[PDB]
Amino acid sequence: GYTPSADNLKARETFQDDKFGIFIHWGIYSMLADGEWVMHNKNLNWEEYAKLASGFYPAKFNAAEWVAAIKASGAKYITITSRHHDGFSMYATQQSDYNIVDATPFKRDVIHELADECRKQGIRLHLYYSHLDWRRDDYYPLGRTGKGTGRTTQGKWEDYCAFMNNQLTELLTNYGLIGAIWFDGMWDKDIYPDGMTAKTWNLNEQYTLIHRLQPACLIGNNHHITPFAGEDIQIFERDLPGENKAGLSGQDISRLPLETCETMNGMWGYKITDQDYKSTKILIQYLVKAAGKNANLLMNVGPQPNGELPTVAVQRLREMGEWMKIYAPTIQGTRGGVVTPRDWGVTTQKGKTLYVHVLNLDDKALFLPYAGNKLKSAVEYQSRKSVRFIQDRDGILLKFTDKPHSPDYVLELTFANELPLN
Ligand SMILES: C[C@@H]1O[C@H](O)[C@@H](O)[C@H](O)[C@@H]1O
Ligand SMILES: [Cl-]
Ligand SMILES: [Zn+2]
Helix axes 110-121, 63-71, angle to 10 degrees: 40
Out of 222, 223, 238, 249, mutate this one to test ligand 1's pocket (max ligand atoms within 8 Å of CB): namely 222
What single string gives the DSSP state of each residue in 246-307? TSS------SS-EEEEEESSS-SS-BTT---PPPHHHHHHHHHHHHHTTEEEEEEE---TTS
Cα 296 to ligand 1 centroid, rounded to whole Å: 17
CA distance 188 to 173: 28
Is the four-CA dihedral 255, 257, 262, 264 of positive or negative sign?
Answer: positive
Q: Which of 10, 2, 138, 123 is nearest to 68 (CA)?
A: 123
Identify whether the C-beta of residue 246 lies closer than 8 Å to the C-beta of residue 239. Answer: yes
Q: Give CA separation, 359 vs 27, 288, 294, 363, 409, in Å.
A: 37, 9, 17, 12, 7
Binding-site residue numbers for Zn(2+) are: 112, 116
User: Taken in order 162, 163, 165, 169, is the CA torsion positive or negative?
Assistant: positive
The answer, yes or no, to whether any atom of ligand 1 lies below 6 A from the CB of 260, is no
Taking CA 107 as the corner, what is the angle to CA 101 and CA 113, rounded to the nearest 5 degrees? 85
SS3 346: strand
C-alpha of residue 192 to centroid of ligand 2, in Å: 38
Start-to-end Cα distance in the chain: 25
Three-state DSSP at 209 gives: helix
At residue 407, what is the residue type? Answer: P
Which residues sit directly before a break in the chain (C to N > 2.5 Å)?
none
CA distance 382 to 338: 22
Listed residue (198, 187, 309) closest to 251, CA to CA: 187
Phi, psi of 274, deg, nearest 5: -110, 95
Q: Is 237 in the pocket of ligand 1 (CB under 6 A)?
A: yes
Q: Is the CB of 117 under 6 A from ligand 1?
A: no
Angle at 146 between CA 144 and CA 150, to 5 degrees: 140
8-state DSSP, 187? G
Pairing verdict, β 409-415 and 375-380? antiparallel
With beta carbons less than 8 A apart as the criterion, state whether 312 and 275 touch. Answer: yes
Starting at the earlier edge strand, list the strands of the sheet with 375-380: 335-336, 345-350, 353-358, 409-415, 375-380
What's the CA gap between 112 and 171, in Å, rounded? 10
> Is 133 near ligand 1, meaning CB less than 6 Å away?
no
| Listed residues: CB within 5 A of ion ligand 3 | 116
The closest-lying atom of ligand 1 relative to the alpha carbon of residue 184 is 5
Any bridge partners for residue 390, and if so which?
397
CB neighbour burial string for 110-144, b if at least 16 within 10 angstroms, e if fewer: bbbbbbbbbeeeebbbbbbbbbbbbbbbbbeebbe
* Residue 39 near residue 85, CB atoms below 8 Å: yes
CA nearest neighbour of 23 among 237, 294, 210: 237
Residues 6 or more apart in contact with residue 263 via CB below 8 angstroms: 23, 238, 299, 300
CATH hierarchy code of domain 336-415: 2.60.40.1180
Question: How far is CA 184 from each of CA 93, 228, 267, 402, rounded to the nearest angstrom?
Answer: 19, 13, 16, 47
> 6-333 belongs to which homologous superfamily?
Glycosidases (3.20.20.80)
Ligand 1 binding pocket includes 184 (Cβ within 6 Å): yes
Q: Alpha carbon 314 to chain centroid distance?
A: 18
Domain map (residue ranges) of the chain: 6-333, 336-415
If you measure from the C-alpha of residue 16 to the centroid of ligand 2, how many angstroms do you get, rounded to a whole number? 8
Whether the link from the prior residue into 407 is cis, omega within 30° of 0, is yes
CB-ligand 1 contact for 36 (6 Å cutoff): yes
Rounded CA gap, 406 and 417, in Å? 31
Q: How many residues does the structure list for the chain?
A: 422
